[PDB]
Amino acid sequence: KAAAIGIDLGTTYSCVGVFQHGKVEIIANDQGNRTTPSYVAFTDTERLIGDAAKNQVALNPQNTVFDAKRLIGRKFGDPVVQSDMKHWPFQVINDGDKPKVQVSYKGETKAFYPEEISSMVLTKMKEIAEAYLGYPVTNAVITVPAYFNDSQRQATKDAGVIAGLNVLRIINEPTAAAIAYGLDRTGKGERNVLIFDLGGGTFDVSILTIDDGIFEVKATAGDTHLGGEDFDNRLVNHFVEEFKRKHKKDISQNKRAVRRLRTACERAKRTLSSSTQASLEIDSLFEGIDFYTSITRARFEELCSDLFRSTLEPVEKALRDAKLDKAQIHDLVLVGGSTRIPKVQKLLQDFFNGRDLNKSINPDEAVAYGAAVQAAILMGD
Ligand SMILES: [Zn+2]
Numbered sequence: 001k002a003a004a005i006g007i008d009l010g011t012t013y014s015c016v017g018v019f020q021h022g023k024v025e026i027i028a029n030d031q032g033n034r035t036t037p038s039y040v041a042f043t044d045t046e047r048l049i050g051d052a053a054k055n056q057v058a059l060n061p062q063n064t065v066f067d068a069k070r071l072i073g074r075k076f077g078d079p080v081v082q083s084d085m086k087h088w089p090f091q092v093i094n095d096g097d098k099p100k101v102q103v104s105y106k107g108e109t110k111a112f113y114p115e116e117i118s119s120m121v122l123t124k125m126k127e128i129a130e131a132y133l134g135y136p137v138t139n140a141v142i143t144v145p146a147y148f149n150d151s152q153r154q155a156t157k158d159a160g161v162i163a164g165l166n167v168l169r170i171i172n173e174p175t176a177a178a179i180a181y182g183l184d185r186t187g188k189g190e191r192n193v194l195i196f197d198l199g200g201g202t203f204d205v206s207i208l209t210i211d212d213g214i215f216e217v218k219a220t221a222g223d224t225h226l227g228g229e230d231f232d233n234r235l236v237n238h239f240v241e242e243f244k245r246k247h248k249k250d251i252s253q254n255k256r257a258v259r260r261l262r263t264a265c266e267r268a269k270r271t272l273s274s275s276t277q278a279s280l281e282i283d284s285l286f287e288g289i290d291f292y293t294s295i296t297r298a299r300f301e302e303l304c305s306d307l308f309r310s311t312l313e314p315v316e317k318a319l320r321d322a323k324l325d326k327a328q329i330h331d332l333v334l335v336g337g338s339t340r341i342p343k344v345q346k347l348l349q350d351f352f353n354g355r356d357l358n359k360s361i362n363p364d365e366a367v368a369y370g371a372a373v374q375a376a377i378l379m380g381d
Contacts, residue, residue: 004139004168004379005129006371008176009118009156011069011201012228014038015365016125017372018133019381024180024372026365029128035337035364036128039066040120042105049124058259061089063103068117069201071099072159073152115155119162126163140165141375143367146172146206146217168378173197174206175215176370177335181358188212191330194318196348198311199228199338199364205314207322207329219322221314226307228266228338234304235265235295239280243291251286260285272297273340301343308343312351332357337364 006024008015013035017026029036029050037054040047041064048056057064067088074081076094085092091102093111100111122142129137142160144153153170160167171179174195178184183193190211197204203226207219239261244250251257260282268278276297285291301308319326334357338344349355361369 002135002137002139003133003381004141004375005126005137006176006368006373006375007122007125007140007142007160008173008365008368008371009069009122009125009142009144009159010035010038010367011067012038013200013364014121014125015368016129017365017368018129019372019376020133024369026362026368026372027129027132029124030131034362036121036124037066038069038118038121039064040068040117041065042103042110044107047105047120049120058256058263063090063105065090065101065103065112065117067201068101068114068121071101071114072118073114073149073155074099115159115162118156118159122160122163122165126165138164138166139168139375139379141168141176141371141378142170143173143176143371144170145204146174146220168375171371171374172206172215172217173335173367174204174208174217174333176368176374177333177366178208178210178215178331178370179373180361180366180370181331181333183331183333183358184210184213184215186210186212192218192322192324192328193331193333194315194329195333195335196311196315196339197335198226198344199336201229202227203311203314203336205311205318207318207324218324219318221318221321223310223314226311228269228336231269231304231307231338232262232265234307235268235300236262238295238303239265239291239293242293243286243289247286247289249286249289254286257286261291268295269300269341270337272300273337273342297342301341305343308341308347311344312347315348315351326352329355333366334359334363335366339363 003018003020006017015035036050039053041053075097076099092099093102102111157167193208195206204222209216264280271278279294282291
């Protein structure tokens with residue numbers, strides 16, 4: 001009777017969709033948001049997930065966990081884990097060569113495996129879907145990066161089961177995006193699809209060949225220097241510099257000032273996709289000083305011009321590795337919040353010599369949309 005849900009369990013944000021009433025619907029959370037932060041915070045009295053957790057990250061950096069997807073299914077000694085650890089404000093410890101995030105919760109030290117943390121984010125996505133549907137959800141399709149190995153896939157599935165979900169299938173994020181656009185519904189004959197995913201924890205480019213509904217990953221490329229946070233850092237530095245030649249004060253060492261400015265910038269980036277201007281209005285940013293300002297989109301698209309231009313190098317590389325010419329790609333698919341930035345669309349379109357783009361589905365929702373279609377297919381509804 002009950003519909004199964006599709007969940008994009010993202011590094012920074014997650015999204016949940018469901019097929020019902022003949023169409024896919026992406027579900028907004030209780031704050032009206034279509035995507036939810038993959039954050040979990042522990043306080044003296046409660047466990048916060050999603051928006052509530054992200055909202056108090058500045059007040060509780062040591063016990064606000066995020067990026068659990070970077071740890072999931074990995075070993076403590078993994079060089080990736082060892083390297084990422086120096087950048088997180090929360091503690092990660094070794095337990096049988098498995099990493100655990102250690103925090104203070106209700107006055108005591110507690111540690112959680114990465115799948116436990118992600119299970120909490122999945123529980124929130126599940127609850128968001130149940131609030132909307134009005135009934136219990138017990139089945140889901142969850143997505144993962146095409147480059148996840150068996151251990152990362154297992155741990156992601158485990159996170160879903162811990163959350164009380166029967167995991168129908170774990171499918172690749174770029175595959176889910178292709179399914180969202182109905183690109184696997186043709187018949188015999190290879191179709192080459194390129195998925196350009198920008199705005200999340202990392203920049204991923206995937207080239208898939210689809211033949212009679214069968215997906216094959218032909219190439220994967222990316223740039224870890226082009227995560228959504230790297231574009232935000234550009235905005236942050238811009239405003240730190242602006243604040244400096246206005247008040248002759250450098251707020252870069254004040255960890256709290258920088259946090260709120262970061263928050264403001266992310267917010268700014270988004271509206272700049274729809275607006276030609278974005279306003280920053282921070283009361284008492286530094287030493288009681290208020291910061292009200294704004295940024296224009298081409299100052300921004302300019303501020304990040306080199307970063308945006310850099311996204312084409314992994315595209316060129318992927319084509320080279322897949323042994324395909326630009327003209328041999330049949331469809332271009334946008335995923336990730338930053339692909340709605342006009343400059344980004346122009347760069348990809350121009351690189352492909354005027355090709356139009358599959359962009360009718362909000363890019364930061366396409367993966368969950370495809371997961372929702374697949375879940376319905378597997379349920380038989
Ligand atoms: Zn790089």
